[PDB]
Design a protein around this nucleic acid. Structure first.
Ligand SMILES: [Cl-]
Ligand SMILES: [Cl-]
Ligand SMILES: [Cl-]
Ligand SMILES: [Cl-]
Ligand SMILES: [Mn+2]
Ligand SMILES: [Mn+2]
Ligand SMILES: [Mn+2]
Lengths: 78, 91, 96, 104, 94, 108, 83, 98
DNA sequence: ATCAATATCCACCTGCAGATTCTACCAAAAGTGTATTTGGAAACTGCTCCATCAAAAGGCATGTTCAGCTGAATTCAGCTGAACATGCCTTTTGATGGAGCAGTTTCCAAATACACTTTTGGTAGAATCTGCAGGTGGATATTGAT
DNA sequence: ATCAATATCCACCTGCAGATTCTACCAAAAGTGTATTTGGAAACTGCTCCATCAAAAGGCATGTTCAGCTGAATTCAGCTGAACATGCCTTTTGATGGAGCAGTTTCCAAATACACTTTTGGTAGAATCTGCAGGTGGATATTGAT
């Protein structure tokens, strides 16, 4: 399902990041990097969900998870 | 529960009387205000503790502002804070 | 038949996407990806829509920021093409 | 007759005090602490809204949206530093192309 | 004149358990004291937020456990959760 | 009138449950602390301390010393993938670094 | 006596030793001044906060704990100086 | 006839030697003057606990050594073996220091 | 560096969808007034350590010479990645049904708080114990060769 | 495949600075009793999300062509490493005076507590207002040909 993150979408992200030319190996590399990122964040968000004895991941769970990891997200509070 | 929207809105009308703000943007300002509140209160909490004090006073808030804010933001902040405390105390 | 030179469309695209703010990954494939990863942690999870959206905002900003650093690594090596080795240097220096 | 009105502030002093008492920060809170804190918060808010308002009128819009907050923060050296680890949703990035990538 | 408390005698007891004939330098003991204080604050700080998020006024062993799971990597968390659970069930039987 | 037994001995721990409790209460972490909280916490601090001393003790025996010094602590942590992660932003005074030369720098 | 220009006392050989610990085999001549400016910025940042803690405590003596807290604030936890 | 090691040989021995040891590599008294000069510029008549200077020295050197490691990676990435200011600068930029 | 032919961008415009404001009610915050307690600022003062000084030994910084080999520049080919055309399909978006969560309230048993009294584990120095810092010399490895 | 020259490895030895063990005082856990809090079993209710379905609308996958970027090869000037001598200034260690930590006491300004009263921010429909989803034509950039 990582494959559902398409080469065109990855190209667009690099374009916003200012990138002009892109090696063919970048697309798989990027998929693994995103995967690691999402594993880490979702692992913690779910941990907050469970601690609260909820079965639904809330936006605030994700915000706490991102905070724990030195990333602060504005706009989803709270 | 609560948010800072009406206060953010009042301050918007002060600096830009004719400018509005979208709902998503108001949400970013709410996170901003909450984030900074927490950074300062936490630093002020740590300051009182290190010094074996049980009270957070305006002096802890000030030092926390000096630790957290860069350069010129710190200077104006400390000014705004002292100014408000002085106006409050006489009133 | 008319043809832009290599790099001209790419620069046109940088300008377009640095101007804009919309999410760049398709929402459903991303929603599907987030659900899959989560199931390996606990299988009966539900998601608020705003929670999937926080993950997408957070993920895209992360990847865009990483591509900026990656691009600097490529340029440093006097290249104009980003390669996996640039991604790796960037993440290594970041402490990832 | 609000503490906010006595202090000459728009931000809610009584609320900031409640939040300080309830957030487990210390056993006691001085009378001046939430006034000083509310005034810092109000001041930082005005700074960003001033700059985001300017940023909005420059691209000819009358209403601040997240893009304008991001332009405001990322174009300001002290705010950028303060908020260096913060992600603004729907903010995008500063237009910026490395010189070596441009033609001719 | 004043009593200065520290974790040194406890680090030393655990040292003798794992390496009975091994000693430790004072600088190395200062590093272990810093380590114990640092992890104490990390766990306790996370447990505090967990309670605050969930509108709870009490930090229980459950908050401690979740904090450990949020803070420790992988197998370290597992073994920590095991030791902590064992110590609590044992204590309660006492 | 009962004869005192410490909470640590009840818990089967070496680390001080009583002290950890006091430190939880004095640290502004919450209004109340459950009885099991300081026990679980003490047991976790004790476990981590054991893990590190185990590996550092091994590092001392390898360079022929009977006494652990900061170097052995640093070798212990950085050669362990989970300790290294946990202490990724930590500086060990007098720790030095792991020997490590990039391959491209060695002679042909 | 007036303290002046003490960054220049961080010598080229000391800078070489640090790079050697860092695994570096060859060093441009411009590196020494660059390193001196980077160290100065670092120490300015840490010492500024440590003194702020010193002042808040109303002391005239900077302690190791003031430095530990300053470093902690800045995401660089130092072990071995608490007591 | 007189013996001469080739360029790079002695540097490699230094790498092995200092990566083996843990001693401070900056002379202590000049570092202390530096710390005093900078602190004095924030507030006059300050004193230092001796261990506060040593904490500053441990932290500083650990910082610089860690940065040279990253700098060395940026130089190798550009297929050089020599570190240059642009490498330090790339490292600090990606670190978020600059 | 011009010119014409192409392809895409981007001001400009404007109705209306849906954001914003108006209309209005109301718990729950926030304020007030009064009564009590109390953390911590002041004012000491003893006793650590910090600043400073100095000599002397010698470690190490500094300066110089010189050539190995590195970075920088240039040239060139193959092969990768960008730009398209083409057409097949995944995603959007717009609804629906309904269950299965959270979020509230009440209400007592179970849990924690906290002052006072006993008891003892933890600390500070004192008294011992003893790894290993330094200071050797020799064995062994590595280097760069004429 | 040796040789000479160097550096590094790596035990050995032993007094003493640093670590460990011991001792006694006492601060703080522990035991007890009792006052408060609290989290939870129950019993509700209305949002939410999940599952499903389908019509099109873009958007992606694919193949081909070739511009031009990457990497290899090659060349050369000059920078940076290695090796020396010289002597400056760091390091040691030792002594001394005294600033200013900390430890103690006293006692108010400033905090908490609590009862009671007003004010207001959150909330949700209804009523209005006005930015923008799209839809252009003209403006602007780009390209191959000279
Ligand atoms: Cl690669
Ligand atoms: Cl105050
Ligand atoms: Cl508990
Ligand atoms: Cl450079
Ligand atoms: Mn000065
Ligand atoms: Mn008192
Ligand atoms: Mn109102």
């Amino acid at each position: 399902n990582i494959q559902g993150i398409t080469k065109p979408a990855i190209r667009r992200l690099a374009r916003r990041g200012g990138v002009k030319r892109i090696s063919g190996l970048i697309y798989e590399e990027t998929r693994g990097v995103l995967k690691v990122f999402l594993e880490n964040v979702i692992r913690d968000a779910v941990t907050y969900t469970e601690h609260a004895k909820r079965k639904t991941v809330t936006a605030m769970d994700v915000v706490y998870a991102l905070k724990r990891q030195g990333r602060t997200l504005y706009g989803f509070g709270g | 529960k609560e948010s800072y929207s009406i206060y953010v809105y009042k301050v918007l009308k002060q600096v830009h009387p004719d400018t509005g703000i979208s709902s998503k943007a108001m949400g970013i300002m709410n996170s901003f205000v909450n984030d900074i509140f927490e950074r300062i209160a936490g630093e002020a909490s740590r300051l009182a503790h290190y010094n074996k004090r049980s009270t957070i006073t305006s002096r802890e808030i000030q030092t926390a502002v000096r630790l957290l804010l860069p350069g010129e933001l710190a200077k104006h902040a400390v000014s705004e804070g002292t100014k408000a405390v002085t106006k409050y105390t006489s009133a | 038949p008319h043809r832009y030179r290599p790099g001209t469309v790419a620069l046109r695209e940088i300008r377009r996407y640095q101007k804009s703010t919309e999410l760049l990954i398709r929402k459903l494939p991303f929603q599907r990806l987030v659900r899959e990863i989560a199931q390996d942690f606990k299988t009966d999870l539900r998601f608020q829509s705003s929670a999937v959206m926080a993950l997408q905002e957070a993920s895209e900003a992360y990847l865009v920021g990483l591509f900026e650093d990656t691009n600097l690594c490529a340029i440093h090596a006097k290249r104009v093409t980003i390669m996996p080795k640039d991604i790796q240097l960037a993440r290594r220096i970041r402490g990832e | 007759k609000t503490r906010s009105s006595r202090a000459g502030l728009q931000f809610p002093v009584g609320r900031v005090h409640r939040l300080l008492r309830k957030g487990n920060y210390s056993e006691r809170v001085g009378a001046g602490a939430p006034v000083y804190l509310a005034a810092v918060l109000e001041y930082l808010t005005a700074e960003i809204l001033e700059l985001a308002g300017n940023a909005a009128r420059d691209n000819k819009k009358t209403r601040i949206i997240p893009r304008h907050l991001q332009l405001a923060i990322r174009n300001d050296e002290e705010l950028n530093k303060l908020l260096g680890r913060v992600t603004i949703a729907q903010g995008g990035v500063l237009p910026n192309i490395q010189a070596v990538l441009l033609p001719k």
